[model samples]
Every structure is written in C-alpha cells, then in structure tokens.
Target: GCVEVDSETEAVYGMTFKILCISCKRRSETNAETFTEWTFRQKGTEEFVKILRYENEVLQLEEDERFEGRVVWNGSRGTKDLQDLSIFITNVTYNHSGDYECHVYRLLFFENYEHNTSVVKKIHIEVVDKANRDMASIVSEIMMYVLIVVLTIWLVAEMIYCYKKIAAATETA
Candidate 1:
C-alpha cells in the first residue's frame, strides 16, 4: 500500500510492475545449479496459473497468452548464488491484480548424494482504476505546500525580529 514505486506491490491502471525476488544462498559451499519459477493467482482465485519460468540455460515462455510478449527476464544466470530473480510485466490491467509466488530450486550434493533445495517468496499486487494515481500527486502536493509554509513562517519571524531591532536602535539614536 505504501510502496515507493511500482515493483509488483502496487500499480496504477495500464502501468507496469516488476516482480522482484532475490533468493538467498542456503549453503554457500554447494554452489548449486539454480533456477526460478513464478506463479500467478488472480484475486479470489483458488489455483495459480503459471506465468513465467526461467533458468540460466533456457527460457520457457510464450505458452501463456497474457504474458506472451509482456513478460521479460531480469534475473541472474550461470553463477553461484543465483540471486536477483525479477520479472517485468507490461500494460497492467485490473485482472492483473493478484498474488505472485516465486520458487527458486537448487541442486545440492552431500555425502556423494544429490539433493534439491529451494526458497519461496510471495508478492501481492493491487491494480487500481487510476483513482489511486491521485495518491502520489496529492500527497506530494501537500508535502510541498507544508514546506513552503514553514519557509514563509521563518521569514515572517525574521522580519519581526529585524523590525524590533531597528526600532530599539532608532530610539537610542
């Protein structure tokens, strides 16, 4: 509700949002092969539809028409601690408001055996009908007016002080 900018938490009508996720390294020594998967569940929906998924080697997309050309990869690849799992969605709509979940899977080895580890994160997006856009403009305007009022008050106080000082000096002269 109180986000600084559009990063999947909030957005106005017809705007874009970035689903930012950064999965941490569970065990640094493993240096496991990592890939990230994202799922989207619209508001009031029971099941989440797979929207985007990506790995360092290949990209799996174009199946979903909603995100056919609107989704872009903005993540890391081919390196240890594969973090920075972020994606961008363009031309957001009211239906786009939903809960997004990200799962990062990594292959680990221990005792000469292979294992898989993963991390999960969630993002709740709310897309309004441009009514919410007024929030920023009005809030910023009020803040600007408050700043101007403070400066004006300071100037008035200074003028009063100067007037009193001059009056005292003139009386003495």
Candidate 2:
C-alpha cells in the first residue's frame, strides 16, 4: 500500500517511517530462496540507491550524498511468513517523501531444473502534520476514564442497598 504525506503546516519536524513488502506464490511453496536486490529510486531521476543486495546484509550506497545514512533496513533477519522485508527511514524531510520500490528475487526448481525470478513492489509515502490527530486521541482517552468512574460508583451504591435489605429480612425472621 502507498500513502502520501504533506508536512508543510505542522509543529512536528522529524519523524521515522517504515515500508513493508510481502511476496507470496499461489500454488507453490518457496524453498532455498533468498532476496537478491532491493532498491529505492526517486521520482523523475535517472539514478537509484541500492539498499541491499545478494542476501549479504551489506548496503551499497550511491554516489549521491543526500541519501547516505537515511535509507536503511530494519534488520538482517528473515521470517517464515514470506513477508519479512521492511525498510526504515529516519529523520524524514520534505525531500525524502516520494515513491519507493522494493524488489526481491527467489529461486524455484522442478525436476532438476532451477530458475530465478524477481518481484517489484512500490510504496508511495507522504509526511504531514499530525497535530489534529494527536488532539483527538487525547479526547478519546479522557472519555474512557470518565465512563469507568461512573460505572464504579453506581455498582457500589447498588451493593450497599442490597446488603441493608438482606439484614432487615433476617432480623424480622
């Protein structure tokens, strides 16, 4: 999934974001398959930045200094769910907002023959001011507390009345 962000009118200046990629085959299971290349390319540019390659867990940076230390994978671990690839971008700026593509290659074989294929997925990200959203979340929390207090008081009053009626019935008997 892709999202757009507009950060021109907010108090927050710095934020971290993540991109997730999931790959799956319909009728076959993947075995001995590894990611070969993963990259991110800026829109309207001829050059691309290499984030990871060849399953070595090493980054190959481009010549451009703007992308250095900005684009990174979360870690070097793979998961069994076939959706383990994730990228994290830190200290986001206006220039960092764009479309990013993640690619993966897998090896498949049948009857003593092997073939390698690649899949590419794109994510569109946008960073914007979140001050309004933050305020709404605070209001929701306050309402939850008020409801709890009201319910507790009502329950205590009901219990006291029930106990007095029971005591009176026992004395008359």
* Model 1 lDDT tens row, 129-156: 7645457898999999999999999999
- Assess every candidate by TM-score: 0.71, 0.55
Residues 1-173 of candidate 2: C-alpha lDDT, one tens digit per residue: 22322222232337876666655554345454556455555546666566555354555655555456877765335443233456666776666655666676766655788878777876665556563566779999999999999999999999999999999899998
Model 1 residue 38 lDDT? Answer: 89
Residue 170 lDDT, candidate 1, scale 0-100: 98
Error of 2 at 150 (Å): 20
Worst 10 residues of 1 by lDDT: 1-10
Question: RMSD to the native, candidate 2?
Answer: 7.1
Q: What is the C-alpha lDDT of each candidate?
A: 0.76, 0.60
Return the top candidate by lDDT.
1
